[PDB]
Symmetry: D2
Subunit: 215 residues, 4 copies
């Protein structure tokens, strides 16, 4: 599964451990213990979250650094990113489409706003090349590249933490760009753990957009 | 699907696994934006210089059955997930850990070791019979169970990743730890070895701190 | 500050880092009572709790082991229990007859209390008989019941502390742990009145704290 | 106490709970004898009993370049609170020619400083231009360089702080963040002198802290 985000980014599922039943098996130990589907619903509405920690995912994500920084703020998880110290950075930046500024009255037209951003990206990247070409160390030459540069990383997280992540990013208060990545994460989650997902929205989900956007 | 019996009535059973040795290689190799010969070499490299974040992408789920005094020690490992049987929600099964005579291999005692075994079974039986008694007299299960000894068996699920798993082994797979916990740590290591050959070997060679593996 | 719990336990404050204003400084990233207290309620009401992690406490607790097993399940915190390698005593929790109040039991509540005492004595004697006999404590102590008292140091921050109160300062929790949580709650109120106030009004998920 | 780092950054102490003895008291689970209490710190450190050191806590206020904060926020056992770029200054980290010392370059070291200052100025110009044009802050800021300075509060306990020093107060870490960990180390030394010495002697895995002073 690979979903395309923005103009050049993406969310891709690498691996998965367990499914809805993993949560059920884990919960049975307490009381010595169709019907299973009813237990998940029960857990969800009564606040028994731990059982869901036994479902785990690993995603491959390519996103603009300003999005990555917000994502990494989630501590209950594991990360592994491409290094800007040990690698030659590619010429890939997130250039917002004109429709992104729709809703805001601006002096200059959306195409103009979009034209300038690209321009600054070229001057920035061109300079980055002179320096690397001139013998400057990569780890120091990259401080000139803008926050709209694309980066890649792996993310391993369990169901319970993932639901905390959707509560916060698949919401209208979070930035538009990362909301797009949230929907992709939500979609994949629904495909792998449909019962848990349904119960989530119906009982514990605190955000707004997932109750108005299919999958 | 593996299972290993511990002590007289306990066990360690593997329920699931996510990934393998290459999971660590793929998570790491993504740093340089990038063959069998190379891959094993990479894992040892990471292990040598302490780059352990990549091994966090390997996960295990166990099902354990052990006495309460062992479980308590085990639960101190916070970087992991747990689900246990509730003593305040169901009737408790007459299953206690009774040490065998050999347990005293090295200690000379007033009375024969066989008698120590007999004595332990007695106080356990007496305590168990009082538990059933108070229960049938209408006493709340959560209250009646407080008379039960620490050798009563419990059960739980444990989901943990490879990095934390290696931390558990450095601490419990060691002679300084109690003999009962060692037995369980040995079982955890045999399963870890089975599923992650390269990683397990690299661990024993450039990082394992214990002394019984 | 020390509060006695049950028949021989307690919760005592050992140290504290910060107060309500610690959360205000963290949220504004820098360094008028009215202005600050309005922010604390603002953050509480919208779910922005990270600022409260910058407040921390360290308690010294003395509880029965079964109460301690539930308590230790709270992973986002620090613990240190007595082992007898640096600091051992032997006392047990014997419920009062009022504990069985409400339940209609076969024998008198006063007899339930007696039977618990009897077992404790027999279990305790057997234990000493084994030590004087030459069995190492690590083995001998496994015959001691779950109502055996222990002690530990607990260091936890405000965010996690409020999670602890949402689960233990509640009727679904066991009565014994409830008593310890009520104690934890009073001390918290004393050191962070504003934060405690806002907690009860917008985020407190339990029931018993609003009744006492 | 506050300490300057790089061309415009710093590390500032905001608060602290406990001292060396807070570990001693936690290890014994109690509450006097210096020779003894200090002897225990060393024992704990030598035999790996590190949980007692979790009972000492700090809060720092840091100002640093975004490419430094990113590497830093990587430490999960800790608490963070940064300034909002999409809601909440013309300050960027401009390397000195002495920073490119030891590297053979086709152009004068001073030219690098000038090449980097130029783009920073350009970018910043187009940014302030977009803001005034009506473009939302969260959008117009995507054109700013990774060397833009940010600020955050950091609360971490002594055990976790020792892990940070192991990895960052070391020659394998970028030179920039090495400077910050040195300041972190200095404050830590001042507040918990017994733990720091024991740490350096029995557990520290890095290199520079045994070479440089405080
Ligand atoms: C009435 C009652 C009955 C209970 N019955 C049982 C039972 O039968 N069996 C049983 O095993 N337990 C039982 N518990 C314990 C309960 O399941 C929790 O373990 C306990 O409340 C500690 O909570 P926590 O996980 O939220 O907190 P902490 O472990 O202290 O964590 C605080 C927060 O960080 C989180 N977190 C920490 N680690 C992880 C992680 N690895 N993955 C995802 N999120 C994480 C969550 O957001 C959490 O709320 C019971 C508790 C109560 C109050
Ligand atoms: C021989 C032996 C004797 C012992 N004696 C005692 C005793 O007298 N008293 C007692 O209370 N316990 C005792 N213990 C338990 C021990 O102190 C730890 O609680 C136990 O090993 C759990 O380990 P951990 O902290 O390494 O693991 P986890 O909790 O699973 O943590 C793994 C890693 O994450 C870390 N970490 C997690 N959370 C935090 C945090 N909040 N702050 C800083 N770092 C963190 C560290 O890098 C740690 O190694 C003993 C254990 C052994 C093996
Ligand atoms: C020279 C250098 C180069 C680096 N290069 C890269 C790179 O190319 N790509 C990249 O992505 N990162 C890179 N890093 C970051 C590195 O991978 C770690 O993320 C960083 O050092 C944070 O360390 P930590 O995990 O030890 O600490 P913390 O996250 O603060 O954790 C402290 C302790 O608790 C633990 N712990 C916490 N959470 C978990 C968990 N979920 N599972 C198991 N144990 C846990 C461990 O015992 C740990 O040491 C680099 C770091 C250095 C110093
Ligand atoms: C719309 C929006 C705006 C934001 N604005 C800002 C801003 O201006 N400044 C800023 O600094 N950040 C900001 N953030 C980041 C926010 O403050 C959190 O850091 C982020 O949401 C990560 O969430 P978390 O703590 O719930 O998750 P995780 O770090 O993944 O933790 C999950 C659970 O474990 C817990 N937990 C983990 N560690 C600890 C701990 N050490 N102590 C207590 N509990 C713990 C809690 O129960 C928590 O819910 C913003 C986030 C959103 C979604």
């Amino acid at each position: 599964m690979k979903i395309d985000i923005l103009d050049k980014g993406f969310v891709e599922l690498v691996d998965v451990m367990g499914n809805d039943l993993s949560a059920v098996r884990a919960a049975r130990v307490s009381f010595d213990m169709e019907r299973d589907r009813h237990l998940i619903e029960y857990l969800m509405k009564h606040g028994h979250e731990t059982p869901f920690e036994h479902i785990v995912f690993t995603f491959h994500v390519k996103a603009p650094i300003f999005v990555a920084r917000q994502w990494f703020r989630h501590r209950i998880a594991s990360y592994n990113e491409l290094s800007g110290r040990y690698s030659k950075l590619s010429y890939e930046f997130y250039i917002p489409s004109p429709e992104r500024l729709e809703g805001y009255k601006t002096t200059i037209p959306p195409e103009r706003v979009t034209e300038k951003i690209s321009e600054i990206v070229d001057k920035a990247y061109r300079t980055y090349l002179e320096l690397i070409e001139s013998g400057v160390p990569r780890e120091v030459a990259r401080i000139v590249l803008p926050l709209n540069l694309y980066t890649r990383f792996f993310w391993t997280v369990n169901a319970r933490s993932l639901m905390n992540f959707l509560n916060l990013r698949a919401d209208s208060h979070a930035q538009w760009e990362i909301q797009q990545y949230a929907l992709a994460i939500a979609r994949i989650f629904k495909e792998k753990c449909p019962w848990t997902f349904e119960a989530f929205l119906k009982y514990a989900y605190k955000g707004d957009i997932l109750k108005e956007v299919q999958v």
